[PDB]
Ligand binder design. Structure first.
Ligand SMILES: Cc1cc2nc3c(=O)[nH]c(=O)nc-3n(C[C@H](O)[C@H](O)[C@H](O)COP(=O)(O)OP(=O)(O)OC[C@H]3O[C@@H](n4cnc5c(N)ncnc54)[C@H](O)[C@@H]3O)c2cc1C
Length: 432
């Protein structure tokens, strides 16, 4: 049995950013442990569907450990040993008893704590969850952690020049479809929703991306689902059977159909809402001294005055920092202010890259040049409600442009003249 004053359960983005904040807050050797099922120290997970998959000059650990994806210092394994923060890796916790402050591993070792930060993130929804025949076939792959990324890069090499089907139409599907096309596969994306990234993109933003993708040669099948997967005599996938009747040949299937927060360990022990563990503005759960951060947390989003749960890397970083600040504040009796996050999401694929800030609520206007055949695409959109801007999206922005739309989203300026807005959208944002 090992005991630590502070235990972070999980070794992902929030964990890493929490450890950096504990360092900043003066954690001492022997106080903090991070327990992770992964075999490696915390890393910037968005690289797994971006540089990890590049056919040249690919991202590889230890390059993309935290905190370099935000421009911070890199926290190698030796950084945690130098600080006397114990990294307990390749350790899956399979039971948590909050009353006794005890975690148990799959092999039966126990760990106790005084303060617990739940930073377990999400697991992916699987094709078995849709009851799909043949979901269990080989070469049907998911992408959440670096072990998954290595299996994908190995299949890319094994099946080079083949056919790939990507199931899903959110931003993981978009990034995967683009990765496989860049790695020289024939690619088809399949999803039921009426356009890609339907929880964020408008039909007009989506039509840009869908057009750009088809111009790159990616096929897009919307309005259907897979109902089966054919497999050969080795159990390896060979074809995807769709509800619309089409049969797509496939050497590799890669799935991005969403995730689920990893809250099962705590079911019945903490209050839950919106698919997550409910927290206050300091990331403390219904059990004192147990906090929940990142993808699992359902928290008060101060600027919207509503409880929300978000799966954004920026929030994993910032909520981690907030929870450690709150922990340390309570020790010293020093106050900490309520978390005040501005939603920030981004994605990249091919040569494109977009950023979104604020809330996708209201009616939209598009600005700039949304011809997908442009040399250097650059266009955005505003979400307007009650005559003010609530959300902003930008593809192809400079740093100052991105900062300006972030300031629009944060400040919610009023719109006088829509035709001016639309004709000079970024100038609008720069004057704020
Ligand atoms: C492939 C990919 C690409 C992404 N791209 C972007 C992007 O471009 N932009 C963006 O804003 N966001 C993106 N995200 C989302 C972002 O990475 C997540 O929001 C962020 O990782 C959440 O951080 P977290 O610490 O809450 O969870 P995670 O980073 O998932 O960390 C959870 C950690 O806990 C471990 N763990 C879980 N259960 C246990 C257990 N019982 N025992 C031990 N350890 C356990 C996991 O193995 C993992 O180490 C992407 C995510 C993925 C998967």
């Amino acid at each position: 049995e090992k005991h630590f004053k502070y235990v972070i359960l999980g070794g992902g983005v929030a964990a890493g950013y929490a450890a950096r904040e504990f360092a900043k807050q003066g954690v001492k050797p022997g106080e903090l442990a991070i327990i992770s099922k992964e075999a490696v120290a915390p890393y910037e997970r968005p690289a797994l569907s971006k540089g990890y998959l590049f056919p040249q000059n690919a991202a590889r650990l230890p390059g993309f450990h935290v905190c370099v994806g935000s421009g911070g210092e890199r926290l190698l394994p030796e950084w945690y040993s130098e600080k006397g923060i114990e990294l307990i890796l390749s350790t899956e916790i399979v039971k948590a008893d909050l009353a006794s402050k005890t975690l148990t591993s799959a092999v039966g070792a126990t760990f106790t704590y005084e303060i617990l930060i739940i930073a377990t993130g999400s697991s992916v929804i699987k094709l078995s969850d849709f009851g799909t025949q043949g979901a269990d076939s080989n070469n049907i792959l998911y992408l959440r952690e670096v072990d998954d990324a290595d299996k994908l890069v190995a299949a890319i090499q094994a099946k080079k020049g083949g056919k790939a089907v990507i199931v899903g139409g959110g931003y993981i599907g978009l990034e995967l479809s683009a990765a496989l096309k860049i790695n020289d596969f024939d690619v088809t994306m399949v999803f039921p929703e009426p356009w890609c990234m339907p929880r964020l993109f408008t039909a007009d933003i989506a039509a840009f991306y869908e057009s750009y993708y088809t111009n790159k040669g990616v096929k897009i099948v919307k309005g259907t689902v897979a109902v089966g997967f054919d497999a050969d005599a080795n159990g390896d996938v060979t074809a995807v059977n769709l509800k619309n009747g089409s049969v797509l040949e496939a050497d590799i299937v890669v799935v991005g159909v969403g995730g689920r927060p990893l809250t099962t360990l705590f079911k019945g022990q903490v209050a839950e809402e919106k698919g997550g563990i409910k927290t206050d503005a300091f990331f403390e759960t219904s059990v004192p001294g147990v906090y929940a951060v990142g993808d699992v947390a359902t928290f008060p989003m101060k600027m919207y005055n509503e409880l929300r749960r978000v799966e954004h890397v920026d929030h994993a970083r910032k909520s981690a920092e907030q929870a450690v600040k709150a922990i340390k504040g309570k020790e010293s009796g020093e106050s900490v202010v309520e978390y005040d996050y501005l939603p920030y999401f981004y994605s990249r694929s091919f040569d494109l890259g977009w950023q979104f800030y604020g809330d996708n609520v209201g009616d939209t206007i598009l600005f700039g040049d949304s011809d997908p055949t442009s040399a250097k695409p650059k266009f955005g959109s505003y979400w307007i409600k009650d005559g003010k801007v609530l959300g902003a999206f930008l593809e192809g922005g400079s740093p100052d442009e991105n900062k300006a739309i972030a300031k629009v989203a944060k400040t919610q300026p009023p719109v006088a003249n829509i035709e001016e807005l639309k004709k000079e959208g970024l100038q609008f944002a720069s004057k704020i």
